[PDB]
């Protein structure tokens, strides 16, 4: 029966990950998944399943999964928890409180860490309204807060909404880049296709 898998390694090993503000949303469907090894790796610094549990997970088929993926400095993976607050939650990535899936996060300070300032990685900093479940504000109009709009000028009350991390090699432990993959297991009303082994 087992012949193929979902192209999980195409992110669980991918060369670069998105800035969390523009977090990639790799849609996964039309495949099967041996989720256990996606968990039994002893390499992840975090794997928490919400609305589901790692037990019996391989029985779980879904219409699809929406593997959201990005990079955030290690500790702040805690804002990846449904109903959490925080800048990733408030302004970069909102997990619905009624989430049904899993979250994966590992260190990558060997890979996504470089001197000189890696402007590869970015996150939103100023924003009018809080976010929505699985919504992505890649667009980058420059925020305003008080009397005047910004005209395209950035100054006081006028700041570029995205700032970087700068994963310096000499960073502290709490500063390390966790690559994060959020496997949202969606079962709307379509055929369930992303099944488990056997």
């Amino acid at each position, epitope marked *: 029966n087992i012949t193929n898998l979902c192209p999980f390694g195409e992110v669980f090993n991918a060369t670069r990950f998105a800035s969390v503000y523009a977090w*990639n*949303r790799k849609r996964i469907s039309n495949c099967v998944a041996d989720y256990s090894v996606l968990y039994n790796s002893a390499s992840f610094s975090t794997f928490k399943c919400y609305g589901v549990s790692p037990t019996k997970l391989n029985d779980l088929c879904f219409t699809n999964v929406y593997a959201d993926s990005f990079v955030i400095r290690g500790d702040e993976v805690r804002q990846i928890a449904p109903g959490q607050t925080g800048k990733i939650a408030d302004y970069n990535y909102k997990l619905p409180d009624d989430f049904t899936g899993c979250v994966i996060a590992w260190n990558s300070n060997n890979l996504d860490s470089k001197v000189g300032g890696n402007y590869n990685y970015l996150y939103r900093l100023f924003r009018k309204s809080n976010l929505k479940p699985f919504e992505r504000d890649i*667009s980058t109009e420059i925020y305003q807060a008080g009397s005047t709009p910004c005209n395209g000028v950035e100054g006081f009350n006028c700041y570029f909404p995205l700032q970087s991390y700068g994963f310096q090699p000499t960073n502290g432990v709490g500063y390390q880049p966790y690559r994060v993959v959020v496997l949202s297991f969606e079962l709307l009303h379509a055929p369930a296709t992303v099944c488990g082994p056997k």
Partner: antibody
Amino acid sequence: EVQLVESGGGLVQPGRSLRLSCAASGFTFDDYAMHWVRQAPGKGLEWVSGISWNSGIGYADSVKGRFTISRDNAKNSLYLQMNSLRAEDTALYYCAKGRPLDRGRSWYDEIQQGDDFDIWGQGTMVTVSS
Amino acid sequence: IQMTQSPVSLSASVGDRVTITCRASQSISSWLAWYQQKPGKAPKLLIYDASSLESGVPSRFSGSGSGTEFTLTISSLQPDDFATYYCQQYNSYPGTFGQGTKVEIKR
């Protein structure tokens, strides 16, 4: 045809921001890693920035930060938010798609391709005037 | 690193066999692509990997070399090819292109 069309280009004051577009067509824009490559007036081509199938690549040296690539596979339109445009960024910017199938590149294989940029968009001219 | 053609320009009438060579600033493996860019239009792809061929070009083009120096040659020639030509590098993004030698063939 397998075509690129870019917009948002014209006279812009020095340092004033601007956002391009590249409403690519045909090819699975969800796979190949775009790049914005600017040709000076008459002079050579020159890589400005790139972006992987998911996101994130370096830029040219004097253009990091002040530029910001981005895309949206769910819409088919690469972006380029340009900020603090200096004198030299006056050029014609071409959208371009990397040569190889960068859907799921190798995790750990010593490659770092640089034989790319197959299809070039028509190019959206950009000036810097006072 | 860098990638600079050896000629600066050249004219050599139709029906001629000519070479254009690009030398590096360091060992750039062996990946390279070649661009002919007619005046005012969008550059085109000619050779990838510094040797192979891609479907969509007449076979008259040829590429060889490795390491630091590479070469692109045109043997049987047509009116169209009168155009600018560019190399590039790969080692590490950014991978630039280089000066670009013209070809204004007519003598």
